[PDB]
Amino acid sequence: MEVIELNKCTSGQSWEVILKPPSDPSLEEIQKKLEAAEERRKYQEAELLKHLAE
Amino acid sequence: MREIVHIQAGQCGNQIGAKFWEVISDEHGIDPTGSYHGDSDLQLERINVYYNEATGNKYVPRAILVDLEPGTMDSVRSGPFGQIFRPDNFVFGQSGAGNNWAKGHYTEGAELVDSVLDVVRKESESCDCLQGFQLTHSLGGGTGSGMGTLLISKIREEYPDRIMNTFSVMPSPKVSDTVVEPYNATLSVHQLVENTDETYCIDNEALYDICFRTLKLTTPTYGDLNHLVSATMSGVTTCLRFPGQLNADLRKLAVNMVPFPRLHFFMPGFAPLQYRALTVPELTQQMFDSKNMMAACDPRHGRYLTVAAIFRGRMSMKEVDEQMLNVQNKNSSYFVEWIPNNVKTAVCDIPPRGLKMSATFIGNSTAIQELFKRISEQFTAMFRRKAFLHWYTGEGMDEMEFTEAESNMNDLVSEYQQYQDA
Amino acid sequence: MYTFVVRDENSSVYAEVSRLLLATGQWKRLRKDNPRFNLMLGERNRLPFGRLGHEPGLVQLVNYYRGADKLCRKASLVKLIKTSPELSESCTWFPESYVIYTDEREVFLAAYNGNVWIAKSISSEASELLDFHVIQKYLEKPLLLEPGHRKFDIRSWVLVDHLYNIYLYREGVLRTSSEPYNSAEEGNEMFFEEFNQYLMDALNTTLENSILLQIKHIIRSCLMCIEPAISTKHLHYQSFQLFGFDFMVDEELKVWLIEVNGAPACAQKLYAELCQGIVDVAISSVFPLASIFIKL
Amino acid sequence: MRECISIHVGQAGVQIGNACWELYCLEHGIQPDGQMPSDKTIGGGDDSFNTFFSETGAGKHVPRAVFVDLEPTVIDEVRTGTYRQLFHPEQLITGKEDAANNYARGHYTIGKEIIDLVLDRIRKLADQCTGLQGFLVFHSFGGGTGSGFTSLLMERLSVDYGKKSKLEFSIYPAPQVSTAVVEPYNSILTTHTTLEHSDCAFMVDNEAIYDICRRNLDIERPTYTNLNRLISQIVSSITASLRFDGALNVDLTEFQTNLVPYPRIHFPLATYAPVISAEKAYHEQLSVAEITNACFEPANQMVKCDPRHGKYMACCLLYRGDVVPKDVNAAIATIKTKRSIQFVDWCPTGFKVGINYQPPTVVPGGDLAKVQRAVCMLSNTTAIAEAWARLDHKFDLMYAKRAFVHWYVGEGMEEGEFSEAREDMAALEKDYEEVGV
């Protein structure tokens, strides 16, 4: 049971005790994702208005 | 600010709508003249949901009154809270609909519908953030049924991204005006399936049974029937009108209650239906009892998709939570296992008038198919002989439209049976 | 009205337990996938312990101890005994065993130099075993019943409740051999009453003294050892489990531990009595309604 | 000195944000008006508390925080609350209507319209940083905003601040304090999109906080106020190293270094003790050994699971109050000989211990009693995967019937994102099992 790296300060202190040793998408791609979804809403809304128009 | 626009159409729609406004105006402390005289700031904290603030600190309902004859709306204007409604929001014709869906939807109603939409637009434009629309009507008549669904169709075109909910009164031979009610109802249901987010199915047969069997009223009037509807509507809208743990608009409430777009027809319930106050176990027991259901459908004949329960009054929230967890764990076979925790409960500190505490039930059960089956039987019984069809073809309708409406409701029924055996 | 589910149809024991619960009229059986349950008669393989104790307003109980497989596996039992300071190599009542695929191939051959062993998961030659799991020391001199000159083993059923009380069922059974032992009763099942009378007449001793004391010692030793690893004392759910301990006895009346079964079967005429006891102290103790065990 | 910016998203994030900043002010001796009599470096200085607080020429200590919600009713309570003078109006961002518990709504529909505004306000705080560490993000899993908008924000933060670390404080959905049903969807969806953007995430199951409040505080029906004040304590224990002088977890980087050896497995379990009722008159003060032993009691964990049936990859002990190193090590040696603490073979079986001499601060009039010593354990256990198992099971039950899916598709989201997110979670559970058993 070894105690290592004992650092002391006015606010407190810290150390490590060992018991045993071991044996992104770009800005463009995000904009493509968001606008693809916005377009799918517009399409589904258009099919609604088309249905109502009939 | 989460404003709700209220619309009421036809005889039934306006008489029920008036009672609703009569009740919630009392709860919020608004007198018939529109002046506030309550005793708590909690009555005004969410007053903007159903009321517009006038010039002289008055509160005018965000309500629009529609009919094809002036008879019923003259009665409203001459009623107790008749003067509280905005005069311009009285939109009426003279011809009437003659209990005919075609007249309400295609001929007579079409001549009046734009006039209503102008009032709707006027009310909507003055909303900080429109929450959604609310319609009270019957499905067995002509105006509320035919023009009501026509209005809904129009509103969805002008407001495609807004919630559209209805409080719909289902016809029944036990409480009937004309024989063509199943015709009008079938035609209306098809519209509601596609163009509403939530429809509270209020069965007049159920209302009659409750007044007769439970309330011990030998000869129930429409007034007695509307008393139950008024109390239920107050309970359903309680969490929206008062501060509480529940911070949700119509959309969020719709999201948690409707797993499938077409299957959005709810069974309302209320408890109690007396000086001796009820206990929380008693409230919960009655709330799930068929005798307190208003859709005239036996919940044991189906399964609950989702359930909402609203408790009003000062009570042990722990005891409420325990009692709700009691009913579910004693009847788990009636709740679908493929929707975890489908029973949600909200409490409100402010009770309704006359009761120290109450409970309102909102059930999305597959047993609601019994109502549509019942309507479908009555429909087919006449339609196989093309009986009384001349009333409709005389307004320009074809037999095919009837066949299509009949087929869409049978599809709805089959869809409900699909998830009952899941 | 309590609720329970059955997720192990092959369970011989809990098929009777579930039947007794229904006969009380205070227990309703649910669908196997219904989460709103009080009691769970779970499956043997991959029991979803992680989904237990997360139902508001429902005290949940399960008929299996999570992590008890460390005691009910061949390779795990050996590892548990050699590594635990409360057992260690000086175990006395457990045969010298070795784990081979850690592994202990070089250690086994060292002790190899009466030298007959048995591998499982019997030969005097070490090469015949490795070419064929754990290798255990085969008891070359077992106790034999007379008349018959036959080998036998003793099965004891042990119930451990949610409070980790250890209950030993009074009725055990002997799975005897029909053929005479060669080192070159109804259905072979003898119960305690007869076996006790035999010991008194033949060896002038009792079942309690010569054997049962050592048995109670071993059972209590194994379970109290693995207790801090499997205990559900402060868990969000509770566990109980029936165990099947298998024993051997030599000519010197010494008791040896063979294996431990997590899902054991019971004797025919003992089903009615044992299963009833399970309901009383392991189920009704948690879910009260409207002794055959020896507490260790 | 290096600064840390906190971001509070959705109702859960904002209200918990309020609880923490309230607690921070009490700890650092900052008055509600922003003044701080302790700070002698007026209008500047680079002390440890300056990591979370900026300073004006007037002497006001302003939190480096941003509050964002898609509806104003919750944040408006901050604008007129006790600490209204603490925040700048630009730090408080609100929208018209919320995401209605719909991930797709918060991420795609509404989030798109407000994402640029939020980033710009964050940029305002970033420009006042000499050397920004990274971000601390508070949000729920179940909410449409908390899940939907957060994942979108986390994506953009990696684009605009690639060198900066991002820590999460996430609220795991519990049915007992929720009225929503689609939370398993939102939880899985936001975890899948945020996973490769969060360096370290602390999950807090409301079920755990609920029972701790019921059991240890004698509260029958715990409110959000109850839950948040307790959550704030745990959060305070975790961020104390960033706000005080020390050598353990001094920056956001060391959190990943000391707790997260494997990137995807960045969900450390948190355990806290002691939780004592303020209405409890006579109370025997617990020792160092007693509160340390409690760290291995499942009933004190932020997520209910059984670490005994998993493996540890890392473990930190954060003590606050009257605590000496001698008693700590004396407790650790004893605990190992009574507890089943298994580490993975490729990690040292040890403990990184930190002590903050300043005793725990509690909100005056709160439900939590004042204690002389307290400890928060941060352990990376494979046992926390039980929470993923529960969550994914509820997902499977509903998605098999495609229940509620139409709400998400109607907001422009494709159905394929559901299965894509679920497959990621299936892989996540697999990773835990390989490391574990």
Ligand SMILES: Nc1nc2c(ncn2[C@@H]2O[C@H](COP(=O)(O)OP(=O)(O)OP(=O)(O)O)[C@@H](O)[C@H]2O)c(=O)[nH]1
């Ligand atoms: N601990 C804690 N949890 C909360 C709090 N408020 C809400 N939650 C939880 O957060 C989950 C989702 O709700 P919200 O966070 O309010 O949703 P949102 O982020 O506002 O997103 P919207 O759906 O657009 O409103 C629920 O399961 C709640 O249990 C809170 O104050 N404290």
Ligand SMILES: Nc1nc2c(ncn2[C@@H]2O[C@H](COP(=O)(O)OP(=O)(O)O)[C@@H](O)[C@H]2O)c(=O)[nH]1
């Ligand atoms: N509950 C209730 N039902 C009504 C009332 N008035 C009419 N109904 C029902 O509504 C149907 C008649 O529709 P009605 O509203 O009178 O015709 P409309 O004016 O064209 O909409 C019948 O099935 C009646 O049973 C009422 O005041 N209360």
Ligand SMILES: Cc1cc2nc(/C=C/c3cccnc3)sc2cc1C
């Ligand atoms: C879960 C839940 C759902 C819910 N839905 C409600 C509906 C209100 C309403 C009012 C007017 C028009 N349309 C809908 S109240 C309610 C309460 C709970 C707990």
Ligand SMILES: [Ca+2]
């Ligand atoms: Ca005309």
Ligand SMILES: [Ca+2]
């Ligand atoms: Ca300073």
Ligand SMILES: [Mg+2]
């Ligand atoms: Mg009429």
Ligand SMILES: [Mg+2]
């Ligand atoms: Mg919100």
